[PDB]
Design a protein around this ligand. Structure first.
Ligand SMILES: CNCCc1ccc(OC)c(Cc2cc(CCNC)cc(Cc3cc(CCNC)ccc3OC)c2OC)c1
Ligand SMILES: CC(C)CCC[C@@H](C)[C@H]1CC[C@H]2[C@@H]3CC=C4C[C@@H](O)CC[C@]4(C)[C@H]3CC[C@]12C
Length: 271
């Protein structure tokens, strides 16, 4: 029955305006991707991954808009809105499903270049939906399990298991980062060693652009939330600075993902 942004208050205020502006424009971009790929556009097998990534970003950015408006309602007009603490569990489920969708997209590009005749012919057509519902289900499972052992789900919880599942989510996140780097490196090795007709500069820049956007925008909230708070053992004086700048980086990730994975790839027809 508390907000995670009222620990300091006056020092936190300008990242909340960044969180609100970036989160509304990312909600607009994810809403356009969700509307277009849900109804208007025709979906291939990669568009299932782009759609489920925009759904994860939509859930994460609307929950960041809610936790922004709770701080803004407490700061300006002074109303302590007690939005329930199981919203944090669905926010982390959205965050983990978004980062797993980024590693899935990178693995799918690596598989399309390394085994191209299998990917054109023998790949099953429902593999995207299967892999999406398993990664969403496992991210949801880790999220409800962590929020139930850390007390976000109906206020029962023991620490000694809460840190051992926060370490599990941190290990899963660095595993997703190493899967994205291994797939984006094997794809770049095959493209810069063994191509004949490809645009190599745009492909190289797009691949390491997704890698750096992952590493310096998606990942820092998960490292500062599931791992750094147990190992740094300081609760106030760094945490009021390193938490909302991490939320600004995560909202920048969830705002940049609809552009990079849908709009840049498809809407180059416009200009
Ligand atoms: C001065 N008092 C202020 C109160 C205060 C301080 C810090 C703080 O964020 C950590 C929070 C919010 C909060 C955030 C998380 C997110 C990361 N893992 C889920 C987890 C928990 C549960 C928790 C944390 C610790 C050590 C955390 N060290 C800072 C120990 C046991 C424990 O529950 C078993 C939290 O507690 C509500 C609240
Ligand atoms: C089993 C539980 C955890 C899954 C439910 C998760 C919810 C939030 C939603 C959000 C967006 C949804 C996806 C949106 C797009 C499609 C494409 C469709 O052709 C197969 C289902 C699939 C892939 C949906 C699966 C479920 C999904 C990921």
């Amino acid at each position: 029955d508390q907000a995670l942004l009222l620990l300091c208050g006056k020092e936190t205020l300008i990242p909340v305006f960044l969180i609100l502006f970036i989160a509304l424009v990312g909600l607009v971009g994810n809403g356009f991707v969700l509307w277009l790929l849900g109804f208007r556009m025709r979906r291939n097998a990669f568009s299932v991954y782009v759609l489920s990534l925009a759904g994860a970003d939509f859930l994460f950015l609307c929950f960041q808009i809610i936790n922004c408006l709770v701080y803004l309602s407490n700061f300006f007009c002074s109303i302590s809105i007690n939005f329930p603490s199981f919203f944090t569990t669905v926010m982390t489920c959205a965050y983990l499903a978004g980062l797993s969708m980024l590693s899935t997209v990178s693995t799918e590009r690596c598989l399309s270049v390394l085994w191209p005749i299998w990917y054109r012919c023998r790949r099953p057509r429902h593999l995207s939906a299967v892999v999406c519902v398993l990664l969403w289900a496992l991210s949801l499972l880790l999220s409800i399990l962590e929020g139930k052992f850390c007390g976000f789900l109906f206020s029962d919880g023991d620490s000694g298991w809460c840190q051992t599942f926060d370490f599990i989510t941190a290990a899963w996140l660095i595993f997703l980062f190493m899967v994205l780097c291994g797939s984006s490196l094997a794809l770049l090795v095959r493209i810069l060693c063994g191509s004949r007709g490809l645009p190599l500069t745009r492909l190289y820049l797009t691949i390491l652009l997704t890698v750096l956007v992952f590493l310096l925008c998606g990942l820092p909230f998960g490292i500062q939330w599931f791992l750094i708070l147990w190992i740094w053992k300081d609760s106030d004086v760094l945490f009021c600075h390193i938490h909302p700048v991490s939320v600004v980086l995560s909202s920048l990730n969830s705002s940049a993902n609809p552009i990079i994975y849908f709009f840049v790839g498809s809407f180059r027809k416009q200009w």
